[PDB]
Amino acid sequence: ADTIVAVELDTYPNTDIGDPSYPHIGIDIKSVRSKKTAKWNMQNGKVGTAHIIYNSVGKRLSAVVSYPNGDSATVSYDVDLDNVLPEWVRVGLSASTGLYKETNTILSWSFTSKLKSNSTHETNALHFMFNQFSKDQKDLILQGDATTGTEGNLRLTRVSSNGSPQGSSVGRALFYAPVHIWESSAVVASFEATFTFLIKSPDSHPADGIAFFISNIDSSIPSGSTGRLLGLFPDAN
Ligand SMILES: [Ca+2]
Ligand SMILES: [Co+2]
């Protein structure tokens, strides 16, 4: 039932559902089967950073993922999000481990959306940024296994008290205020999203991955979404 638009950092390739044979980054429009992908040289144990940009004039959603001292990976897709998403939506982070595991730690997360109307004032906006997470992080909706406060970070998937990641885990963090992406009077709508992450695993085959996503305000973790479904989708269709 949920309506999901997402940018995915897919660390475990599942070639039987359309994934490339290599870890990658991709744009998902209402399906795990990414409309576009790009090769991603994931670095186990290092902090990477993901950037996601869109505007209603260009009508293309793009994402760039990079690690310090490393060439970045870029993926883009032509898409009018007004035709897939509702007027009011919630944005968030999601992550999953399945048969294989990894830590899905968010060290920082910022977001900006602006609606620009034909009138002279011309600006409606929502912006937030987390560089320090708290135990009772009231302005975030945590779903599934997601917790906050551990080393002031957001953990989207379950991690043991000794630091070891756990498998068969899924978790998301939604910003608690709804976001206004469409408006009748608007002449241009746009948004940016940024987040820093630490994926770490004792396995040479980490799984499953981390995604940013924009969805209906009542979205919840679909049941059985542990694994490559990344907490976003109920199936691989
Ligand atoms: Ca995958
Ligand atoms: Co994928």
Q: Which domains does the chain have, with CATH numbers?
A: 1-237 (2.60.120.200)
Q: Report the distance separating Cα 66 and Cα 43, nearest Å.
A: 10
How far from each other are the two terminal CA atoms of the chain, in whole angstroms? 13
Tell me, in angstroms, the distance from the centre of ligand 1 to residue 196's CA.
20
CA distance 231 to 46: 23
Contact criterion met (CB below 8 Å) for 197 and 67: no
Write the burial class of residue 141 (CB in 10 Å: 0-12 exposed, 13-18 middle, 19+ buried): middle
Which numbered ligand comes closest to the C-alpha of 228?
A: 1
The whole-angstrom separation of Cα 219 and Cα 235 is 15
Asked if residues 28 and 19 have their Cβ atoms less than 8 Å apart, the reply is: no
Degrees, nearest 5: CA angle 142-144-145: 90
CA distance 208 to 102: 7
* Structure resolution, Å: 2.8
User: How many angstroms is it from 19 CA to the middle of ligand 2?
Assistant: 5
| For the CA of 11, the nearest ligand | 1
Tokens of 102: 């990894």
How was this model experimentally determined? X-ray
Tell me, in angstroms, the distance from the centre of ligand 2 to residue 25's CA. 7
Pick from 237, 220, 232, 215: nearest CA to 85: 215
DSSP codes of every residue in the chain: ---EEEEEEE-S--GGGT--SS-EEEEEESSSS-SEEEE----TTSEEEEEEEEETTT-EEEEEEE-TTS--EEEEEE--GGGTS-SEEEEEEEEEE-SS--EEEEEEEEEEEEEEESSSS--EEEEEEESS--TT-TTEEEEET-EE-GGG-EESS-B-TTS-B-SSEEEEEEESS-EE---TTEEEEEEEEEEEEEEE-SSSS---EEEEEEEETT----TT--STTTTT-SS--
Residue 6, phi then psi, degrees to nearest 5: -145, 155
Strand-pairing partners, residue 125, are: 114
Instruction: Fill in the amino acid letter for 57.
Output: V
| CA–CA separation, 109 and 111 (whole Å) | 7
